[PDB]
Write a protein that binds this ligand. Structure first.
Ligand SMILES: Cc1ccc(C)c(Cn2c([C@@H](O)c3ccncc3)nc3ccccc32)c1
Ligand SMILES: [Cl-]
Lengths: 147, 142, 126
């Protein structure tokens, strides 16, 4: 008998270069037991503890003049407070200095366990989609597992 | 009430398989239960359904010299016969001070009877086996 | 129905777990109430205020009823060099056959670096 636990693993659309579009319709991506992907946001079907997790990968060929600051954030939009509450966040400076030009790879991973309500809208956002790496699949994903 | 019918696996790396990330099930605290097979370094699924899938690898380099470390979990379905990646991480880490990069990949997936999950790296030379529990691969049916 | 625990860190000098089904928490360790398959997991977060070559280790070990052994373990190294802040999480998790009365500890080498949803330890019976 299949599991009744809400789950979801959405992935970046690799053709949507310049955005971070989460897909559920894509091979090895998934929504189940009530979880929805609406408006680039996961929608929690029922209260409980969820494991939330996301990976994003950044890439640049060399370091430019302006300082590069990469951020990744999992936000929450509750029905009783319909403004983004940050759940998880992290920030990486992949460049110490400007190149006087080998390629760099900055992943950002966020995971934790949080209490969610029914109708919670979860988003996972980055500041610089132009540095996202869609070179092969599996690298950029966002997902939840009810515990 | 009784023991669990759920398919599961937790396989561990062989520290003396050179140039290989060789997964093993016959070890203490390792495990293949309820139809999960380890076949050609690939865990094989016995039933359709939702599974958690996870792997840890830990690389270590004594200092730096352009180093890239990749860790990749991938699916082959009976039906499609194509090797698709499920989760993937690329990392550039760089006396000579020793560095450590753990890479933990995990997620929830919808698998089909007879899929062949595999967990791989680009650089086995950089694997660390300092202690036990450092390098591993498994699935857990929900 | 099934044994479960989710314990978290108290926000000095100790990673101490705080607080439920069949599962006790004697002496900073989860105590398995019966034989079977368990999904054991944890996370911890280290933060530095700027960087002694430091290695942050996090380890979940089984104390089987009579020795003590690593189940899951990782080492991070935050600094490549000797005042910018850094954050470094370590993730552990996997599925394990276990005995009634086994103890599961989740430890760190440097409590001094710990930065107290990101610092937990738990189990779930399958
Ligand atoms: C997504 C996923 C799939 C399978 C497993 C076994 C895990 C490991 N896990 C962890 C933590 O180590 C973690 C978190 C985020 N991403 C990677 C690891 N925290 C957990 C809490 C509950 C269950 C498994 C938990 C995580
Ligand atoms: Cl050990």
């Amino acid at each position: 008998t299949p599991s009744d636990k809400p789950v979801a693993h959405v992935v970046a659309n690799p053709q949507a270069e310049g955005q971070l579009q989460w897909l559920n319709r894509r091979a090895n991506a998934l929504l189940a037991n009530g979880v929805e992907l609406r408006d680039n946001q996961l929608v929690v079907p029922s209260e409980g503890l969820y494991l939330i997790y996301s990976q994003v990968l950044f890439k640049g060929q060399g370091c430019p003049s302006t300082h590069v600051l990469l951020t990744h954030t999992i936000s929450r939009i509750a029905v009783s407070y319909q403004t983004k509450v940050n759940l998880l966040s992290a920030i990486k400076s992949p460049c110490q200095r400007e190149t006087p030009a080998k390629p760099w790879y900055e992943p950002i991973y966020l995971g934790g366990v949080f209490q969610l309500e029914k109708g919670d809208r979860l988003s996972a956002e980055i500041n610089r989609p132009d540095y996202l790496d869609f070179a092969e699949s599996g690298q950029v994903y966002f997902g939840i597992i009810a515990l």
